[PDB]
Homo-oligomer: A and B are copies of this chain.
């Protein structure tokens, strides 16, 4: 193709996964550029200059994959787009923009991706992303009308800081761990910094900032609503989500109660999902099995008897939050663009 691609925020975890994935698809080193801010990184038999995202000239680039935070994206994505670059942004900066498609590669690319008057395609929230290839298939069959979601979120979603917080707490208390059986305050945890409570040997039902709307929901709770709506193209979708942090390094999981407009049996759900792109049907999905692979793992599909006439399911999903949940999806979009 002779396609030219850039990565903005190349040294972060997501940036690293983007690089690994570009490599694992045998993409020429000669057609790749890296950017960060405030000097060389190896990529397939070559050392690549880490340019300055703010001041470097983006022209020549066909596609830029951003994973550099929202503040940077608000400024730099239009600058890159102005220079003729198609920007795929892994941040929240453009997700709520009605002129920016919010795209899961095998879900709404054809429907939404071609309409990008700002030159920007937004990459969805990782937690939402993991459920999308699963729900799309069920929605196409039976029409999805309501979601209840409880998540089990890995710390790598918080960048390196989440990883370090988990590792350092676990290392500090592992020696006396069994005392936590009788007294959760028995041990000396290094004080939390990123999270509102210790994460090692704990669960923490609080992810994100509390939205200033009187709801009691965090921005992460609400992403499950807003982004599912936009991605699935169901503007009035009913959603109640609870984001909960767990002591897992990589791999987000979701306990999903999904209601449809017509009956949908577990057997039929299994039959549809077994075929599906970006999906693997398993008995017991786990984040450890999901970490390092590409598909969303789905299983534990049951009828929810709280929905009349077999229109409700309970199902469980695990997916890698750095791969499909971030890096992989941007690259899959880039492939579909070219």
Contacts and interface: CB of A to CB of B under 8 A. Distances in A.
Given A150-B255, A184-B291, 19 more contacts: A20-B182, A146-B306, A148-B148, A167-B178, A170-B177, A171-B174, A182-B291, A182-B292, A183-B292, A184-B251, A185-B291, A185-B292, A196-B284, A201-B247, A205-B300, A240-B257, A240-B302, A242-B314, A257-B257
Number of copies: 2
Given A156-B181, A246-B203, A306-B146, A288 B198 contact: yes
Residue among A203, A244, A301 with the highest chain B CB neighbour number at 10 A: A203
A326 to B, nearest CB: 12
A304 B247 CA distance: 27
Nearest to A255: B150
A305 B215 CA distance: 10
A163 interface: yes
Contacts of A204: 284, 286
Contacts of A246: 152, 203, 246-247
A250 to B, nearest CB: 5
A317 B253 CA distance: 19
A18 interface: no
A89 interface: no
Interface string A223-258: 001000000000000111010101111110101010
Nearest to A13: B181
Contact of A305 (B196, B206, B238, B266): B238
A266 B216 contact: yes
Interface residues of A, number: 76
Residue among A197, A248, A249, A292 with the highest chain B CB neighbour number at 10 A: A249
B174 A170 contact: yes
A248 B202 contact: yes
A34 interface: no
A202 B314 contact: no
A189 to B, nearest CB: 8
A322 interface: yes
A174 B172 CA distance: 11
A88 to B, nearest CB: 21
Interface in A184-215: 184-186, 196-198, 201-206, 215
Interface string A152-176: 1000100000010011001100100
A178 to B, nearest CB: 6
